[PDB]
Amino acid sequence: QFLRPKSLDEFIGQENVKKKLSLALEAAKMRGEVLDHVLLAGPPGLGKTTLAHIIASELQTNIHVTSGPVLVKQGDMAAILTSLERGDVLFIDEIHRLNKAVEELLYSAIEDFQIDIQPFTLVGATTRSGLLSSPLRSAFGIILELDFYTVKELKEIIKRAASLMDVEIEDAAAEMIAKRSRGTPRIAIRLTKRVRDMLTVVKADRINTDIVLKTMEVLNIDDEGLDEFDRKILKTIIEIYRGGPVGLNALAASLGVEADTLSEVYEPYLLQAGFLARTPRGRIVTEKAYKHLKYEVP
Numbered sequence: 563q564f565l566r567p568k569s570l571d572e573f574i575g576q577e578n579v580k581k582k583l584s585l586a587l588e589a590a591k592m593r594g595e596v597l598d599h600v601l602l603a604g605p606p607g608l609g610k611t612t613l614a615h616i617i618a619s620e621l622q623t624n625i626h627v628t629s630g631p632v633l634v635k636q637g638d639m640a641a642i643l644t645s646l647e648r649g650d651v652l653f654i655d656e657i658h659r660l661n662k663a664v665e666e667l668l669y670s671a672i673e674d675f676q677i678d679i680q681p682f683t684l685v686g687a688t689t690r691s692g693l694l695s696s697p698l699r700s701a702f703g704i705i706l707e708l709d710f711y712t713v714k715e716l717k718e719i720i721k722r723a724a725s726l727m728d729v730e731i732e733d734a735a736a737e738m739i740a741k742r743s744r745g746t747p748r749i750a751i752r753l754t755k756r757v758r759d760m761l762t763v764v765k766a767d768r769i770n771t772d773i774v775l776k777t778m779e780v781l782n783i784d785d786e787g788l789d790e791f792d793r794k795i796l797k798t799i800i801e802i803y804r805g806g807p808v809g810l811n812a813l814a815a816s817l818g819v820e821a822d823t824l825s826e827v828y829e830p831y832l833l834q835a836g837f838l839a840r841t842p843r844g845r846i847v848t849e850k851a852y853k854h855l856k857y858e859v860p
């Protein structure tokens with residue numbers, strides 16, 4: 563609970579997003595108006611949930627946490643919409659997973675304010691903004707697209723997490739972890755906790771490169787920050803599908819995982835880092851993937 567930013571001033575990176583949100587947030591506060599609906603979109607672990615809480619906290623209102631999967635019957639959506647107080651934040655994670663039933667009910671709370679509903683701010687979160695229906699998406703006045711963080715930004719988040727956990731760390735070591743965090747704060751912080759564990763067992767005074775390397779070997783994280791499953795995805799494409807192209811459903815079936823967990827959770831970074839590419843016929847691995855995994859380039 564302690565490593566989560568409580569305000570934008572504590573939120574590292576995402577400069578474009580913070581400037582946009584800050585402008586609208588400060589304005590609404592100064593005018594005492596209800597903030598326009600905000601959509602947060604991007605891969606998991608990038609701080610969407612964190613920003614939702616920061617919004618309510620800055621508006622000095624209450625936040626109601628929920629998700630698309632949870633809201634099954636219109637009754638669920640009703641009970642929540644009626645418990646909202648003026649200016650409250652209704653945070654819906656995985657908002658694109660809302661069934662048409664509760665969806666229509668929620669839309670009616672935007673196009674109007676009764677099913678009476680106290681004026682509130684809808685903050686939705688999704689891994690991909692495009693997953694939302696045309697109608698609902700358009701209802702958002704503010705759309706914030708979160709991209710992966712830079713290595714420098716992640717190193718900053720790491721030093722910050724290390725300090726809060728009462729552990730010293732050398733810059734070179736923080737850099738090494740940042741380079742292996744797959745552009746994600748959540749990943750960087752968890753790696754820092756695991757590296758902290760190594761420091762404890764080896765009885766070191768501070769985290770150095772040696773400690774980080776020992777930890778990465780134990781966690782099976784390579785020099786590109788790829789984990790076991792990341793490599794399984796690339797290896798499966800290379801070996802079973804001859805490098806691709808292979809459709810999403812076929813790859814997911816071969817891997818035994820849901821298509822979403824592949825396209826929304828793991829593929830984003832693999833695409834960004836240049837290990838994978840998407841074509842009309844499906845996914846394909848790149849030469850960088852073959853070389854990194856030590857496979858003879860076909």
Ligand SMILES: Nc1ncnc2c1ncn2[C@@H]1O[C@H](COP(=O)(O)OP(=O)(O)O)[C@@H](O)[C@H]1O
Nearest residue numbers: 565566573574606607608609610611612747748
């Ligand atoms: N910009 C950031 N600076 C510091 N920590 C961050 C940042 N963004 C995310 N985190 C951290 O990472 C974890 C994951 O974030 P979260 O908001 O839950 O992700 P998402 O909702 O996108 O899955 C949180 O622990 C949080 O405190």
